[PDB]
Design a binder for this molecule. Structure first.
Ligand SMILES: O=C(O)C(=O)c1ccccc1
Length: 304
């Protein structure tokens, strides 16, 4: 009557996401004896980064900490969560969360459990200075998050998992990379980064997901306990605020220079990101993308 769920991380273990994950797992275990436990199996060494989505779908493992950008091979819609412009607490209340889960269930045999990273905008990082919002001539590491936007900026893109980024930079295979504001020091990337472009765009999605049959097999007691603890994890998303501010300062102190544009240019830059971001989602999955777009913003925010 105690269930043990096996969880893998699609992100490197020395990263902030795993560092946030591990204490939460420890709490789940300490407070769930006789009910529910989580066995953390480790990171990309356990199941490759881009295959963790498939492992969850087919029940090779029960759970993952992952971003939908890493499992577009399960469903193209997986990458759409970068486009949320309300936090997950508000998603649970306005229909966005439910809609995400229903798509995850139907298209990926996966239950969408919780979002444990938000308020972490993405940025371009590079070693080649720019004064315009154009990446012409630059070779930029990406995942699906940045593909549509970086190509619109005329970048030559190359896909790698997070674990390969340092190597690509050291060997000069790329001039830069996409990543959130936070976390570039974890794998020592600051050593090979000279600039961050502002402003940020989209919002990093890192979430817990679960094999759907496994989820349905939980008893009410186990599910309710899991749910209680998932809400605890999300409640700590206020952390991402300080983290973004601190990481921003850390970059300045380590000699990384911020590239800035004027108000009009910055505004257009972000609008372009979302404009091409949504166009891409609409091309891949028109019905779902339209449903999400409606629920991913609040009216009173639209103008601002
Ligand atoms: O740059 C990435 O690998 C990426 O897709 C991502 C997504 C969420 C958080 C951090 C990175």
């Amino acid at each position: 009557q105690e269930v043990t769920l096996r969880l893998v991380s699609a992100f490197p273990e020395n990263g902030i996401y795993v560092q946030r994950l591990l204490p939460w797992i420890a709490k789940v275990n300490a407070e769930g004896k006789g009910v529910l436990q989580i066995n953390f199996l480790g990171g990309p060494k356990a199941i490759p980064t881009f295959e963790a989505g498939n492992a969850v779908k087919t029940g090779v493992v029960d759970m993952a900490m992952n971003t939908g950008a890493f499992y577009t091979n399960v469903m193209p819609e997986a990458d759409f969560l970068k486009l949320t412009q309300i936090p997950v607490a508000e998603q649970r209340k306005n229909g966005a969360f439910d809609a995400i889960n229903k798509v995850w269930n139907e298209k990926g045999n996966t239950q969408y459990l919780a979002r444990m990273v938000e308020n972490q905008p993405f940025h371009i990082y590079t070693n080649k200075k720019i004064d315009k919002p154009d990446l012409s001539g630059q070779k930029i590491r990406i995942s699906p998050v940045y593909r549509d936007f970086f190509q619109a900026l005329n970048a030559n893109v190359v896909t790698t998992p997070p674990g390969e980024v340092y190597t690509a930079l050291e060997r000069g295979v790329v001039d830069g990379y996409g990543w959130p504001i936070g976390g570039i020091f974890d794998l020592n990337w600051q050593e090979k980064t000279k600039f961050r472009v502002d402003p940020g765009f989209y919002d990093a999605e890192v979430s817990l997901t679960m094999n759907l049959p496994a989820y349905k097999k939980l008893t009410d007691a186990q599910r309710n306990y899991l749910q209680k603890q998932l809400l605890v994890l999300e409640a700590e998303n206020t952390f991402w605020t300080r983290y973004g501010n601190v990481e921003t300062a850390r970059q300045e102190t380590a000699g990384i220079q911020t590239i800035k544009f004027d108000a009009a240019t910055s505004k257009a830059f972000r609008e372009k990101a979302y404009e091409v971001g949504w166009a891409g989602a609409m091309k891949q999955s028109p019905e779902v993308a339209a449903r999400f777009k409606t629920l991913f913003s609040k009216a009173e925010n639209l103008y601002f």
